[PDB]
Amino acid sequence: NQASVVANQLIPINTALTLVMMRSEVVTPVGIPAEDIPRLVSMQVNRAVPLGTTLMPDMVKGYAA
Numbered sequence: 001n002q003a004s005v006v007a008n009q010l011i012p013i014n015t016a017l018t019l020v021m022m023r024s025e026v027v028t029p030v031g032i033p034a035e036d037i038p039r040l041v042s043m044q045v046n047r048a049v050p051l052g053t054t055l056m057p058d059m060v061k062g063y064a065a
Contacts, residue, residue: 001026003034005055013048017041022055031056032063039063 006025011017017040024034031054032040046061057063 002030004030005032005034005037005040007049007051007053007055009051011045011049011053013046014044017043017045027052027054029054032060036063 003024003026006023006027008021008023011021019041022037022040040055040060040063043060043063045059047059057065
């Protein structure tokens, strides 16, 4: 099964991501894969990202395909 990224804690908007906030877990819809965890570090999202949220590439400003 394809795995994706998911929030681990209450991540506030306009904040930098970390290893704790990011994790591996299969969720739907499958957005960003688990093979980009060390690449999406210190990334600032353009919206509030609470616990249990499939980290997408469009939401992450700067993270492109």
